[PDB]
Design a protein around this ligand. Sequence first.
Ligand code: ADP
Ligand code: ADP
Ligand code: ADP
Lengths: 23, 127, 408, 325, 331
Amino acid sequence: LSNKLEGDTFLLLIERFKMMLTL
Amino acid sequence: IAKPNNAYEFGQIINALSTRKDKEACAHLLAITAPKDLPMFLSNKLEGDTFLLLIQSLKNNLIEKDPSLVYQHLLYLSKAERFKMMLTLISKGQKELIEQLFEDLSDTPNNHFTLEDIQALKRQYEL
Amino acid sequence: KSTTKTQRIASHSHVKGLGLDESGLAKQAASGLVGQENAREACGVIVELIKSKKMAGRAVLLAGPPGTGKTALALAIAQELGSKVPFCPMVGSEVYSTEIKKTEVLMENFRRAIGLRIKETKEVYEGEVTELTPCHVIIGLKTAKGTKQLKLDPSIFESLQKERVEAGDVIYIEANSGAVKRQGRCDTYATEFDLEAEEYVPLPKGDVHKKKEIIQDVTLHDLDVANARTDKLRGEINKVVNKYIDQGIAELVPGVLFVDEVHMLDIECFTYLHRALESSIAPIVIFASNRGNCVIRGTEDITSPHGIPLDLLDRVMIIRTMLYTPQEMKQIIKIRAQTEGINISEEALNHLGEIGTKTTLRYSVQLLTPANLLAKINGKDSIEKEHVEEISELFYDAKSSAKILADQ
Amino acid sequence: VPEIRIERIGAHSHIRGLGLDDALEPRQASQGMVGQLAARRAAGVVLEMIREGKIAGRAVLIAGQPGTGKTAIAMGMAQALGPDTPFTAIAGSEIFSLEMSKTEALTQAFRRSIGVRIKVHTVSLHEIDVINSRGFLALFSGEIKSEVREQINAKVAEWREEGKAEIIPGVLFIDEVHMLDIESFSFLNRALESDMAPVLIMATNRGITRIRGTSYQSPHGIPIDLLDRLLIVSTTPYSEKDTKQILRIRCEEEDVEMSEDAYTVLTRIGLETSLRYAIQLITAASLVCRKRKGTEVQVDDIKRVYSLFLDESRSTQYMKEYQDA
Amino acid sequence: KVPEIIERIGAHSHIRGLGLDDALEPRQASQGMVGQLAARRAAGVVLEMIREGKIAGRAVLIAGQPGTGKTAIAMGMAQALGPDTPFTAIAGSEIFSLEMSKTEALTQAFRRSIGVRIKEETKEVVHTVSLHEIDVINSFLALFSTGEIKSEVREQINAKVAEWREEGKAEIIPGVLFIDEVHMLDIESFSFLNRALESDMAPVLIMATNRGITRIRGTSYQSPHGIPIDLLDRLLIVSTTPYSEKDTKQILRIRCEEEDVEMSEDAYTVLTRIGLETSLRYAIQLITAASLVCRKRKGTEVQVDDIKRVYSLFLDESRSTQYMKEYQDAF
Ligand SMILES: Nc1ncnc2c1ncn2[C@@H]1O[C@H](COP(=O)(O)OP(=O)(O)O)[C@@H](O)[C@H]1O
Ligand SMILES: Nc1ncnc2c1ncn2[C@@H]1O[C@H](COP(=O)(O)OP(=O)(O)O)[C@@H](O)[C@H]1O
Ligand SMILES: Nc1ncnc2c1ncn2[C@@H]1O[C@H](COP(=O)(O)OP(=O)(O)O)[C@@H](O)[C@H]1O
């Protein structure tokens, strides 16, 4: 996965994790 | 205590106290220093004043405890680079100081040191 | 004139010599220097060799860690060699410039160490000031002939006021151009401790216009900068110096050229350095190095001790200088503070010396004006420990700052 | 002769000095500055030095990670030194120019930090030089003479003599000082030894780094002769509330109105990547909200802009991960 | 319009000829030089070559650890060729100059290594002068405040020398040119040496080195002694072995007698040890510091404790570099 998390991709599956739990 | 970690700190402490000529400093300074690493720590920093200082600091205070540490310090000093240099700048009069340090070792074989290796060591020391 | 950069030697203003007995040994602390016994004795030996003209194209190398006193030792040697022997410090990295070639940089550095004591026969205004009535400015000068009323330009009056001249002082002004210099007082008002032929001078024999040998010291770079107001000026100055030497009115004195960080010089520059020191008259070249075996710059492959080619390092004898113990560190800091005018407590000295042995001595020396300003802002006259620890927390040294940056 | 960067682009217009005051005691709110009390106090000590006259021959260095406010501290000390003191803010890479050699570029930078006051108009000396040098695009069209500068220096000496002008020593800031090589460091060392010399602030974000132009490594890539004459000031990285306040004052400056949840998500974004990327996102978010006929920037606009424009770490890692094939 | 007219340091003033004699048979005591018998014998063979005229197109290389007197051997061979044989002793690093390019430096050395005799009837007084002196005549801080000898002066001087040679009152003596640390020369200068040796009035070439297989400067190939092959098969290589105790004692005695020093026997032994494991030239340097120290305490002889003081004052090379190196490792 590496650091590819954005708003759209993370919501789809539902380093850049805790930052991702703010959008 | 000033535990030496590098040869640089060792050179700095030994020579800067050489003009002081202070005895018990070297007494409770070389005991904590590992005898085996004595050559590598010493390197070629040997000057006449500091060499005499080690001689008359080892002769005076270190004999109180077990003279085995004296034996390791004296034997591993033989591997210092500038030693055949060193055993001629010492004046003939005070070579008897090293002889008096030696009779504390050869005359009394208390527990550890033996006669034959001490004799070989003296042969190494040219005296 | 006087193009002496008072920022590279102002850090060592307490040094007035080497501090040596008549026997040749070094006192514990005298004339500014408070440590480095064997290095001081070696510098005294070097001075003796220089005075006896046995400097057969040889140079000195000072090998020691930073914050040890290499520049201080060079300044001490320069001060010991004579009353006003020129001293030009220089860092090797400064030879790398584009607007002037390396030839010019080494040129200017070398002419900054070779001095000229010029003894000029001048009619002057050396005498006792009896009365001073600006009406302007008529001044009464009392000498062997008597009291003479002489006219002074307002600029000369400003110089006299700046020199703090009062009624009854044997002071020296220039009559050809005009320049006031404080030489001393008169024996007409001399006390017990004020003798003759000293800081108190008797009635000036002759007249106010005593046409006498005035001693005034210049440097070659001083005449180069006093004539530009290329090699044309070099030749002009050379011919002027030749004429002065031929008269016998000037004495050409060799000085000291200090070169700190010698490993930053190319072998290309080292060849010039060797060639220049072979001359009959040439300043004593003292290198300084804090590096062991390293690559000679400009060769890219050849390693050597201290980055000096073996052709020049051949004529080099090395003095080894080392770290200070905390007691001498405190003494150095106290001497520097007294010279600079800062009152400071003993516990502040202890903490500052602890910082000094922690990183370097010059770092702790440089934290004196900052701490003094911090204490002045707080409303105190003398520095205490809190000011020192605060200024140590605010400003950093290079090693710890780099450690912090690398740490993250 | 005829007479009359950071301010033009912005990003430092809100900082009207350090604002510590209270006899060298940092104030949390102060004059625009937010947080970083230690660096501000050290800077104030530096101002005290400059005012008393104990800075001649020395210079200031500022370390820290990028995005911590080194330029902010430099601008603060520039403002604190007076109302119209010059402030040049060059980088270490702008002395490598096709037209001007390093000597000319560094000389121009230095003369852009020696102001002259005329009775009140304050103008940079290099600006006076460029005025006395002969199309709506002349920035396209250096090497501004060699004798004109001497003539202007003589005329400035005259203007000091008869009392028509006053000399103001400004501030010269060099960001990323490790870019300069040993050649330019010698020029800096030689130029500092003048009576009319500006205060010299350098900035760096690098530890032990090889000196450019040589082979030996040194702290911050600065030669030892200069490194022993430096007042090193270290800046710590920001925390959440400081960057939140920074974003608030910046938005107030550029006329952007934003909600609280958008503010905190922007603060977190800036904490992860940089203050500068978060600042860049603000204008794009405001322009996106204007298109959607919205007056207040919501958090979904922050989502959209963060998805549109990429930060440096993601952009580099994506294509480093590209070269795996 | 044309007028006419190593030892300054005096590190080899005791050297008066090679000393072997006896029809190429090395003498242990001889005249100045001591020991290194094989090197003396090889130097004598090369001397015979130079004397007859069978050295043209060839040169000499001396390889050995520093402190073995290869420069002394060169000085001895220069002396034994005649009392007025010019001898230049430049170093490899001395050709990189701010004012003179490698061409000018090497040409100046070569022309300084050629002598001419000037007979002058008043009795025909013979004055031996090197060519470079005559060049520098045709041109007191001159050493400080160019030195480029112009080409037209050189061609004029060469034509003049040819004329004076044909006239029959001047004669050209090929001297000896010595290049210490020859490994520091680059390929562009080795080519110049190769081309200049192909001349009739070419001085004997001696090159000295103390380093083995090294990269040729200017190239990326490993060659013995850092010398290109095109010059290496035209070389007569002699090697000098390191001294022993008695030889160093003898050289120290000779140098002390030369420099007006009176040293005790045990002091001689301690100084021989000094020159035994640090370097002999280091001891040579120490003798003058010891002499200066002895006069401070109002003494006429130099005792062993004077040596022990001087050795602590001034450091030899190995100690001085190891100090800073291990400091840097501890930094
Ligand atoms: N023996 C000494 N006596 C007086 N001052 C000393 C002595 N040793 C060092 N110092 C001081 O230490 C400071 C650093 O000296 P300097 O030699 O310029 O630095 P470095 O040792 O790094 O070259 C100087 O200000 C000098 O006055
Ligand atoms: N203490 C502060 N007060 C006000 N603004 C700050 C502060 N610290 C950082 N900033 C803001 O952060 C932004 C980026 O900081 P900057 O100085 O560019 O970082 P760098 O040190 O990498 O140049 C600037 O626009 C600046 O306004
Ligand atoms: N056989 C010898 N006879 C006389 N002097 C010698 C002899 N060997 C060495 N020396 C002395 O050793 C010193 C070093 O010699 P030199 O060849 O000039 O430098 P190095 O040997 O260090 O390269 C010289 O001063 C020389 O007088």
